[PDB]
Design a binder for these strands. Structure first.
Lengths: 125, 99, 543, 113, 51, 108, 359, 125
RNA sequence: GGGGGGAUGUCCGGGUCGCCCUGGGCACCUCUCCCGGCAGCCUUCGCGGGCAGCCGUAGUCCCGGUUCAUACGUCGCCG
């Protein structure tokens, strides 16, 4: 899908981006993609990130592999730290609730347990 | 080590190291990141190591393993840090039912 | 730059001189044959010998005795004896602070050392046990001569500054004895910018002499004063410290952190250096048993006395006047009640070799505190005079509130709010009234549930705000305050005010020639005793 | 051998008590030999060490005049080249070494150096 | 009062709620072991000593 | 009703704490306080206060008298000089003004 | 001034027994500094005295001594009351000082106060904008808070002030501590009401959209946790809870990976910034080492420019030399490079163009 | 192994505990175990926890299932909150480093990537 | 850093088409004043104040490319 991404990014497509981002080969495409288009990709993926906070599971692995392959491509064209600037601003957003998000987690993994347990009483009774 | 942090010198103590020395210090820090009696100092000196010797890892792969193996143990240390506080809530939260 | 010098004559006449200069660069030049170098348009070459030991400023170089030896006293706490006939250097290395002034006796037999932390010891030469000792109040001083080492723009620049009240107390069961926190010396303490007072001396009020000394935090007197970058090393400093009701226990608490100029590589995202040292602070609570020979012995350190996801900076501690009970409030929101039980794991009693059991204190009770936040707090605490009830000013900015809690139970008796215009500074109890200072100053009775006294203070700078403090007598029901009168410098005047409880009138108005640093209360008698930065103390008494 | 040089003048007065006016760390490696010379308006001492750098010191102007490091390199330049062949070369004891550059500079006007 | 050179003491790290007490150290300190076997592996009825 | 004790204690100045003749007495200069100790017991025998009262004036220099011993000259930031005699307190109330711009140093 | 205020209090008692509420209310307006125009400012109110506040609230509210009394509105339609709302004096300690006499025998006093008051405000204001104002302004305890959010559940389980009040009460109860919250909830709530607010807070999380996908927190954390424990085991005598903790797990793992990538990108960003700096000075000609290729060098080190100052022994500072600077420049030169000199440099105008090998 | 645990706990064995804790059936045993012995089990497992911080992977799942089954057994004999007291003290220990442990994690998952990537160059080159 | 200018090189509408300009992109040298630190001198006990100030970046006759570190008192065996 490498040329697909190249085309879609440089033409600034929307739905082509959606088609290739619905889905290894991912890594191969990020090996074979370009640099400047990858930074623009970074920009609109932080955009999708900011727009709907639903799934992280593919797209973080994506930008992982961007910084894998063409990480130093932003070192090569380092005027776009203003692209890199907002990602800091973007990824500091999703750290927000974590400052006490676990304080939820335990009392909820508490009521998990007896509800598993009184359930684990239930077929026994 | 905690004295060599008390006096701020841990930088200077670390900077004069070679490859084999770095490996030994690395394997040590990896060996003791687990025990929360001194995880503070372990992680600090590891920070200085990464800050001070991460340049030649492309030259020497053997430390890159230990670098990975450093990462590797820690990867399993956040899970222990979480799995505690997973049960961490549980033990505190029984305590509010007893009254 | 000439830091000092000392002459020596060459002899019913004077045939030549040889005069020695010592410089803050860390050098000691000596000039050898002056009178005939200079008596005779043209003169020959002259050239000092250069004798170089110290890194800091030599405070005082003096010719010796015979004129065979050149002795020297410096910051780095070490008195050098230059041999001057060989090349060698033999030296007395471990002093408690900077060697500030030396003089050589009439015969060569004695040295006098004015140790920079306000003491003096007379040595005999080459026996080096101090045949004589006289110490002073050891406190923090607005010193008149600015410095010896601050001449050449050192990395951390020395500023004669004061940033905290001088932490101290008076001892029940020995009212002649005052405990007070101190550093290696004044100059070494204030150096490094922050306060470094990991030490106590106990000092007599009746006869203003030294009595004794001991350590609290980790101290390395045996060590280099300076990290190799060129900086004085900061050493842990005990914020709060108070005495037990019987006269048997002593709770210190120390905080320390790395320097921001060290951290420098812990910066990850928005991590800044203040953030990082603030993360890596250590806060120890140290429980002490009092040896009636004025000695301190540990019973228990607690490493994290207030914990949340980080160690919580601890606001204050207090002593139950009725029973051996200590009290802590910190950054988490919880107040902890500590009590001495016995180290006894499963019935057997662990004893010191005499058979006496290793008593150990422990967090007896735990209370969370009600918080009421409208849209970085603080804390202050005090028992009643009769005990049984503890009063906790918990301190979010201007919105803050005090809570009164029983001691037998952990239930909240009372809670009062709205009584502070800003950040709370401190709070004490008389027999019915809570006196409290934030930006404002308020006496408020609680059994009447009514504010009695209100005083707005004139606006000053934040350092002055930090340096104001108060104290109550508990024998005559009377309290008092202390405040400088408006960046802090040498000549700064303070006023103190004696206030009785029932009236609004200040019962004694008096300013002082300098800024008064600390007020304390004698438990046995009425009155107060005040410590003033130009290091002198005096008492104040009714009658 | 502690790469140090020290300088001596009599303690004036009583007889033959010499003195160590001062010392300095001059070379980079240690000072294996040094010899004096003084005359025809010139008063120097040459210290040659293991770091191959003869330094001249002003004998009578010491503490008063800057020392001078000579080059450790031979005055004859000991490097030659065939510009037509673009062959650079030099020599020491018995080995003569030759490199080729194969390329211009403007071609490179990084990864290929 | 030339304060003496002392090496930096080691720490007293915080101890968890199960240290081997002095007594358990004692009964571990009954150190050396020897297993004398009986005749023909008879089980051992009774041992004792005078006073 | 309440009363203030006289200021006591003191910080040792940075001036030479002079020996005596016969080495038995050490004479030290605190700010606003000159006091003499006997060496053997390390003990005070005299505390001679010196009233300073002009925001920051300080004891500048002081020494034994080289003509006659048991005499102390002392001089402050402003030029006020006392010629007291230890073992005694005679001379506290009788300074002498030197009329300087600013008195920086002195020796006898 | 005590006598003065006591006489003023006597005059207001006279205004009360004359039932001259308008003139008395004007006196209150003068004290607080009918028209009664407002400053559009919760914070910018002038400071008043606790004695006038306590007399005011004593005048406004009522008590019932039967071993357990009851606050009541003695004047339910009062701009002085709504000023007490917007000025946030409505505290338990205030009303305690107000009724120190009759309540000195009563116990559990904060609890009865916090369970009585916001209900009384609610029946005063069914549009409850006064309620959200009281919530937003007054320092609040957890009892008051649970009773208020209960009132909000009655209101719901022209349509924005209520949701605003939900969020504000949520933040405040988040600020509250655990034990007091939990015991208050267990006192004043019923498990079904708790199920309703569970659905509320679930809806809030999924409406923030932590699962509903990309191309397709801490506050509510402390809340939801504390409430379900505050119910506890005796109440629940299933699939709802399992799908609940399913999406909860999805949420927390999204948080976890979010932490991972926040880290890696903050690294990359700071490196990029120092790299931009470095390429700026390299284009300037300060002849450091910058990286060329499209790949990250492992050691993210941007070789800084030399500070013009130095730290000698012992701790002093002076100026670097030009000379020692040139020494360090010689150090920073690599093994091999090209150093093109231009005619303008030969004229003394421009600077050099250098290309070093990739070290 | 239920009677095995019962025996071993009440006799305060060491190596029997080791044998049964080397290893579902786990859950069945915790269903069928007792109460007071389970609290003592809790105590020595917090002890092992404090003694060597190596594996969490079985033993946390163990104490999970203790609080599952006989969680309210400590509610039944609630004088032993002093057993429950240290676990708070114990499990607050292992939370320590987490206050910045992730600040390690990323820069290390950084150098992961190119080392994967330049490795992913390596067979390609 | 900002605010600004004068000048360098550049594309896209372009313009009678040339001097370049406006509209977008700009990176630089130069000038400007407010940022941070430094030093002197007069002032005043001090606090402060005034004065004309440098530097915030690069490569030298040589050359600061230096100077610089904490005592003895007593060793060993085993408990």
């Amino acid at each position: 899908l490498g040329t697909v991404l190249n085309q879609a990014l440089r033409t600034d497509d929307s739905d082509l981006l959606e088609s290739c981002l619905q889905t290894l080969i991912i890594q191969n495409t990020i090996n074979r993609m370009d640099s400047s288009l990858a930074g623009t990709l970074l920009s609109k993926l932080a955009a999708r990130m900011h727009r709907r906070p639903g799934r992280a599971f593919g797209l973080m692995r994506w930008i992982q592999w961007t910084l894998v392959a063409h990480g130093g491509a932003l070192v090569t064209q380092p005027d776009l730290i203003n692209r890199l600037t907002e990602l800091s601003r973007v990824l500091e957003e999703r750290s927000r609730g974590l400052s006490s998000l676990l304080a939820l987690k335990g009392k909820l993994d508490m009521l998990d347990a007896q509800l598993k347990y009184r359930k684990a009483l239930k077929m026994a009774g | 080590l905690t004295a060599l942090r008390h006096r701020s010198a841990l930088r200077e103590a670390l900077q004069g190291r070679d490859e084999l020395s770095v490996i030994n210090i690395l394997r040590w820090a990896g060996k003791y990141v687990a025990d929360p009696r001194y995880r503070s100092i372990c992680v600090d000196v590891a920070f200085h190591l990464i800050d001070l010797y991460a340049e030649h890892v492309g030259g020497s792969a053997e430390l890159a393993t230990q670098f990975q193996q450093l990462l590797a143990k820690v990867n399993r240390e956040v899970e222990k840090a979480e799995l505690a506080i997973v049960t961490g809530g549980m033990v505190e939260s029984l305590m509010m039912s007893v009254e | 730059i000439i830091s000092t010098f000392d002459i020596r004559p060459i002899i019913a006449e004077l045939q030549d001189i040889d005069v020695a200069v010592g410089g803050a660069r860390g050098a000691i030049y000596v000039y050898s044959n002056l009178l005939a170098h200079l008596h005779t348009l043209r003169v020959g070459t002259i050239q000092p010998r250069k004798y170089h030991w110290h890194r800091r400023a030599v405070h005082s170089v003096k010719w010796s005795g015979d004129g065979n030896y050149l002795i020297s006293g410096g910051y780095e706490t070490v008195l050098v004896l230059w041999q001057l006939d060989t090349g060698r250097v033999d030296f007395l290395p471990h002093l408690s602070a900077a060697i500030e002034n030396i003089v050589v006796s009439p015969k060569g037999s004695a040295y006098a050392l004015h140790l920079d932390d306000n003491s003096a010891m007379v040595l005999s030469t080459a026996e080096m046990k101090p045949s004589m000792y006289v110490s002073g109040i050891q406190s923090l001083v607005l010193g008149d001569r600015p410095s010896k080492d601050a001449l050449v723009r050192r990395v951390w620049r020395p500023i004669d500054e004061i940033a905290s009240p001088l932490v101290a107390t008076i001892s029940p069961q020995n009212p002649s004895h005052m405990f007070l926190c101190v550093g290696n010396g004044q100059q070494a303490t204030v150096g490094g910018g922050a306060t470094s007072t990991p030490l106590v001396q106990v000092f007599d009020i009746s006869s203003f002499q030294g009595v004794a000394k001991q350590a609290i935090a980790r101290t390395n007197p045996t060590d280099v004063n300076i990290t190799s970058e060129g900086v004085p090393i900061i050493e842990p400093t005990a914020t709060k410290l108070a005495f037990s009701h019987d006269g048997k226990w002593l709770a210190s608490i120390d905080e320390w952190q790395p320097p921001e100029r060290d951290t420098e590589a812990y910066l990850t995202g928005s991590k800044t250096q203040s953030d990082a040292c603030k993360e890596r602070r250590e806060i120890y609570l140290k429980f002490w048993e009092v040896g009636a020979d004025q000695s301190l012995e540990l019973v228990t350190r607690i490493n994290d006395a207030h914990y949340t996801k980080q160690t919580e900076s601890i606001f204050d501690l207090a002593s139950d006047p009725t029973s051996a009970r200590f009290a802590t409030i910190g950054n988490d929101g919880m107040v902890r009640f500590w009590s001495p039980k016995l180290r006894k794991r499963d019935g057997l009693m662990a004893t010191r070799p005499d058979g006496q059991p290793l008593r150990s204190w422990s967090c007896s009770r735990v209370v969370p505190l009600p918080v009421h936040e409208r849209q970085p707090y603080s804390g202050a605490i005090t028992f009643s005079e009769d005990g049984s009830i503890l009063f906790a000013a918990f301190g979010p900015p201007s919105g803050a509130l005090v809570v009164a809690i029983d001691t037998q139970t952990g239930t909240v008796r009372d809670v009062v709010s709205g009584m502070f215009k800003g950040d709370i500074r401190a709070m004490k109890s008389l027999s019915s009234c809570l006196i409290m200072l934030s930006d404002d100053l308020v006496v408020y009775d609680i059994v009447s549930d009514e504010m009695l006294a209100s005083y707005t203070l004139k606006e000053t700078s934040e350092a002055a705000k930090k340096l104001t403090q108060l104290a109550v007598n508990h024998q005559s029901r009377s309290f008092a305050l202390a405040a400088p009168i408006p960046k802090l410098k040498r000549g700064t005047k303070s006023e103190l005010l004696i206030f009785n409880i029932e009236d609004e009138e200040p019962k004694l108005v008096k300013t002082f020639s300098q800024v008064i640093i600390s007020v304390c209360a004698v438990p046995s008698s009425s009155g107060f005793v005040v410590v003033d930065s130009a290091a002198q103390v005096w008492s104040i008494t009714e009658g | 051998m502690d790469r140090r040089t020290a300088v001596y003048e009599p303690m004036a007065g009583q007889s033959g008590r010499w003195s160590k006016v001062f010392h300095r760390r001059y070379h980079q490696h240690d000072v294996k030999a040094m010899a004096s010379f003084e005359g025809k308006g010139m008063s120097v001492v040459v210290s040659g060490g293991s770091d191959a750098s003869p330094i001249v010191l002003p004998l009578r102007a010491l503490g008063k005049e800057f020392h001078r490091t000579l080059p450790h390199l031979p005055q004859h330049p000991t490097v030659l080249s065939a510009p037509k062949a673009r062959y650079i070369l030099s020599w020491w004891e018995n080995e003569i070494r030759i490199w080729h550059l194969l390329n211009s500079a403007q071609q490179f006007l990084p990864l290929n150096l | 009062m030339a304060a003496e050179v002392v090496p930096l003491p080691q720490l007293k790290l915080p101890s968890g709620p199960s240290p081997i007490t002095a007594e358990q150290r004692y009964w571990r300190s009954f150190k050396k072991q020897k297993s004398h076997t009986s005749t023909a592996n008879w089980p051992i009825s009774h041992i004792s000593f005078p006073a | 009703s309440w009363k203030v004790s006289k200021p006591m204690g003191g910080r040792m100045s940075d001036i030479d704490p002079i020996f005596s003749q016969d080495e038995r007495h050490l004479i030290i200069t605190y700010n606003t306080s000159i006091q003499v100790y006997s060496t053997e017991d390390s003990l005070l025998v005299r505390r001679i206060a010196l009233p300073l009262t002009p925001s920051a004036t300080h004891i500048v220099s002081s020494a034994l008298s080289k003509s006659n011993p048991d005499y102390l000259w002392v001089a402050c930031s402003d030029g006020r000089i006392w010629h007291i005699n230890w073992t005694s307190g005679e001379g506290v109330d009788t300074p002498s003004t030197i009329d300087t711009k600013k008195l920086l140093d002195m020796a006898v | 001034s005590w006598s003065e205020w006591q006489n003023k209090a006597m005059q207001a008692d006279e205004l009360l027994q004359n039932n001259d509420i308008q003139s008395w209310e004007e006196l209150m307006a003068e004290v607080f500094k009918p028209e009664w125009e407002w400053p559009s400012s919760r914070s910018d109110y002038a400071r008043v005295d606790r004695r006038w506040v306590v007399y005011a609230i004593n005048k406004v509210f009522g008590w019932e001594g039967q071993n357990t009394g009851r606050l009541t509105c003695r004047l339910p339609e009062s701009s002085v009351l709504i000023y007490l709302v917007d000025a946030g004096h409505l505290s338990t300690s205030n009303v305690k000082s107000a009724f120190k006499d009759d309540v000195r025998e009563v116990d559990k006093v904060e609890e009865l106060i916090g369970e009585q008051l916001p209900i009384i405000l609610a029946e005063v204001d069914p549009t409850m904008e006064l309620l959200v104002g009281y919530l937003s302004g007054t320092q609040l305890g957890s009892s008051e808070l649970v009773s208020s959010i209960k009132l909000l559940l009655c209101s719901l389980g022209l349509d924005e002030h209520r949701t605003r009040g939900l969020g504000i009460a949520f933040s405040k109860l988040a600020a509250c501590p655990a034990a007091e919250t939990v015991k208050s909830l267990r006192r004043l709530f019923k498990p079904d009401e708790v199920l309703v607010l569970l659905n509320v807070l679930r809806a809030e999380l999924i409406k923030d959209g932590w699962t509903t996908r990309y191309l397709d927190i801490q506050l509510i954390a402390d809340l939801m946790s504390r409430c379900i424990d505050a119910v506890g085991l005796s109440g629940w005598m299933a699939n709802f809870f399992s799908q609940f903790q399913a999406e909860i797990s999805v949420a927390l793992e999204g948080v976890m990976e979010a932490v991972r990538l926040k880290g890696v990108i903050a690294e990359a960003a700071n490196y990029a910034k120092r790299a931009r700096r470095a390429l700026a000075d390299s284009a300037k000609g300060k002849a450091m080492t910058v990286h060329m290729s499209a790949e990250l060098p492992l050691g993210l080190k941007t070789d800084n420019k030399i500070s013009t100052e130095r730290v000698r022994s012992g701790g002093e500072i002076v100026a670097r030399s030009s000379r020692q600077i040139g020494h360090f420049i010689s150090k920073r030169r690599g093994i091999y490079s090209i150093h093109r000199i231009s005619e303008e440099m030969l004229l003394g105008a421009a600077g050099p163009t250098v290309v070093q090998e990739a070290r």
